[PDB]
Each structure stands twice: as C-alpha cells, then as structure tokens.
C-alpha cells in the first residue's frame, strides 16, 4: 500500500530461522505484507454491513465496538459514526469524550464515544488507520474497557 514502509516486518518474517521457529514449510514462497494477486482476484460482494449488524444486535447477546482513528482518510471516522447512528438502536447516550491517564501528563481526552444499547462508536484522537501503532495506550485502554464491558469514558 502507498506511503507505508513494511520492510522491517518483511525483513524479519523472511529470515529462514524465523520461518523455522514459526513452523513454516520451506517450499512456501516469500512473505509479503499484502498479497497483490489475492486482492486482484478478490470478488467484493457486500456494499453495506447494515443487515449483518442488525442480525447480531437482534439477539442482544453481543457487545459491538466500531473504533476509528480520526486522522485516517482510507476508512475515516465520520463514515463509521454515520453507520452506527443509522442502525437506530435503543438506549442512545449523549456523545461524550473518553479519557486516558498518560504518565505524568495527567488525564487527557483520547477521543469521543457515541453509545447505544449493545453498540458504541469511538474516535481515537490523533490516530490514523493503525490505531494501536499511533496511540498504543489509548488503544489498550479502549480494548480493556471493551473486553470487560466497561463504559469507555
């Protein structure tokens, strides 16, 4: 993909001793971050996940989280905020900022949370496409709150 440097991971995973430690059969071709041939041959079928999410929310057994880094342009935060809102779920909560405790810098706004029953949309302020790479502490805090079914604030 453009503007990305994948050399470090590519150099590591293509090392023969790394492949042996990872139990990779020797005959297999070299490791590429993204397989161009798979992408080219891939037939995209769905245009919207609306029905899939409504099917998952109907059971009321699953906690759903859609999180976006607000400085990403590939899959921007607004597209996903609109999507979550369009699902029109019960128990709509007022949009609020969510906090993260940074070392000695104190409590900081890590982004904004829009919550409904069994579904929440989250922004990660200053993060791009790869949220845990850009904001690792904010990504962990969000992940921890998601697993434990805790409010994101």
């Amino acid at each position: 993909p453009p503007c990305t440097n994948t050399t470090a991971a590519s150099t590591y995973l293509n090392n023969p001793y790394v492949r042996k430690a990872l139990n990779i059969p020797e005959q297999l071709p070299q490791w590429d971050m993204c397989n161009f041939l798979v992408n080219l041959q891939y037939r995209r079928l769905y245009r919207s996940m609306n029905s899939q999410y409504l099917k998952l929310l109907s059971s009321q057994k699953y906690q759903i989280l859609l999180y976006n880094g607000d400085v990403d342009m590939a899959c921007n935060f607004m597209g996903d905020e609109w999507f979550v809102d369009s699902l029109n779920q019960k128990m709509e909560v007022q949009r609020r900022p969510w906090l993260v405790k940074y070392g000695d810098s104190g409590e900081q706004i890590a982004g904004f949370v829009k919550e409904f029953s069994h579904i929440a949309f989250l922004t990660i302020k200053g993060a791009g496409h790869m949220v845990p790479t850009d904001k690792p502490l904010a990504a962990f805090t969000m992940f921890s709150r998601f697993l434990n079914k805790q409010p994101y604030e």
Binding site: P2, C3, N5, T6, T7, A8, A9, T11, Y12, L13, Y17, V18, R19, A21, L22, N23, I24, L28, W31, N35, L37, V38, Q41, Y42, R43, L45, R47, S48, M49, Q52, Y53, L56, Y62, L65, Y67, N68, G69, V71, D72, M73, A74, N76, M78, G79, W82, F83, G126, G128, H129, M130, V131, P132, T133, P136, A139, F140, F143, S144, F146, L147
Partner: protein, 260 residues
C-alpha cells in the same frame, strides 16, 4: 490439550523469553485451504482470559502486521532483526489469535494454489478455521470469544460473526472493528467532506462539488452519474491518494517521499 507441534520454543530477535506460551501453525479452512495462525496466550491468567481473533484487511493483507507493528506482545524494530516487548500489547489481558486470511496471504496457502475468492467464501473458510482452532485448543472452547479486525475486516468480522452466532458451542461475546469498511456509500460521501474540512481541497473544487454532486441539503459523492461530478471526484481521488499525502495518517510523512 494443545498442539505441541505448533508451539514456538525460541523466537529470533527476542532478548528475553516470553512469560506466556505462543503457537504458530495451520488452521484448516474450506476445501484445501491451510490458514497460518500465530496464537499468543494471555500474559495474565490465560485459562480464564478471553479468546480474541484478529484480522487485518486489504483484502490480501497479513494479520502478522497486527502482531509485529500494531498490538502484538513484541514489535519489530527498524533493523528488522530486533523484537522489543510492547507494554500496551493486547495479550496482557487476552489470548490473541492472529489469522493470515484468506489463503495465499503471507504464510497461508492452498493445495491447488487457487487463490480467487469472495466475501461469502472467506467468511465460511474463517469459520472452519475457528472450528479447527477449538479442536486444536479444546481448553479454550468455553472461554469468552471476541472477533476483532481492521479496515476490510469491517466486512470479514460481521459476516464471520453471523456464522459464529449460529454455532452454540462458540461462546461469542462481542466484536470490535477498527477503521473498518462498513458501507462504501457512507465512506465515500464522508471522505469528500473529510478532505475539504481538513484543507486538502480548495473553495473552487468544493463549490464545483457542491453544485454538481449535491441537491438541496443532501450530497451524492458515491454513485453520482453527473458529468462534472465524476471529473471533480477523480480530482479529489488524485489529491487524497495520489499527491503524496499519507492516506492512512494525514499528519504523518509519506514513506519514500512524494512521488515524481
């Protein structure tokens, strides 16, 4: 209890041995597909910690990117030799299953080498791979299952979750999608607005977009048939993804510099 054939004993580039158990092998997908997985057990109480599946997008990109560059227990350094422990690793509180999917992605393969696939096929193949994971790791069958992913996994995860929800043996508790593709229409319409309000497009291009793509209060930047609209959206496509701006992080540099 666990596949001892798949367990990683000593991983190169690590200065210290992991406190947690880790596995690298193959899960059986649909037909003749063998999906490479890298499973990292929880650093704190793996037996009671949730099982988390991680899928990177593309389509065609490896979930090993998620491990070594995003939220894995160790991260690859610029030398491409050294791995350094991540204090914000997702495996601190969860058993993380990184799956290279579909077949052909990274170390994943198929016996027929036929890698032409679709959304419905990938969901079914990922479901069969999940069934195979629980066969190889029976001690995790009753553990809380979470399906997570990034980008195109916005399609991978909900389609997979609809199949998982029909399986009573799988303890599905939830799903998380990072910067995911949920709707092509919503993504394309919001991006044009994102590009203008982030100062990538001028008032001249925006006025032309608002006049030829929009009606009253609503805008159509997705499937608009208007002549100048297609031309203007193509200019937006050139500015956003082909001018030298990093589409993945607007305020970050573009690796390799601005193109010629």
């Amino acid at each position: 209890r666990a596949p001892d054939q798949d367990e990683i004993q000593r991983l190169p580039g690590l200065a210290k041995q992991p406190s947690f158990r880790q596995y690298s092998g193959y899960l059986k997908g649909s037909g003749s597909k063998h999906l490479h997985y890298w499973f990292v057990e929880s650093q704190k109480d793996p037996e009671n910690s949730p099982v988390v599946l991680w899928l990177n997008g593309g389509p065609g990109c490896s979930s090993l990117d998620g491990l070594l560059t995003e939220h894995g227990p160790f991260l690859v350094q610029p030398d491409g030799v050294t791995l350094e422990y991540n204090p914000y690793s997702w495996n601190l509180i969860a058993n993380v299953l990184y799956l290279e999917s579909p077949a052909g992605v990274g170390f994943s393969y198929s016996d027929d080498k036929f890698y032409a696939t679709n959304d419905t096929e990938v969901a079914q193949s990922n479901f069969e791979a999940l069934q195979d994971f629980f066969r190889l790791f029976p001690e995790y069958k009753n553990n809380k299952l979470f399906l997570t992913g990034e980008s195109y996994a916005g399609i991978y995860i909900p389609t997979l979750a609809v199949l998982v929800m029909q399986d009573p043996s799988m303890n599905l508790q939830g799903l998380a999608v990072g910067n995911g593709l949920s709707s092509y229409e919503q993504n394309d319409n919001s991006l044009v607005y994102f590009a203008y309000y982030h100062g990538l497009l001028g008032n001249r291009l925006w006025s032309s977009l608002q006049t030829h793509c929009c009606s009253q209060n609503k805008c159509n930047f997705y499937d608009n048939k208007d002549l100048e609209c297609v031309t203007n959206l193509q200019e937006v496509a050139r500015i956003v993804g082909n001018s030298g701006l990093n589409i993945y992080n607007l305020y970050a540099p573009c690796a390799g510099g601005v193109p010629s």
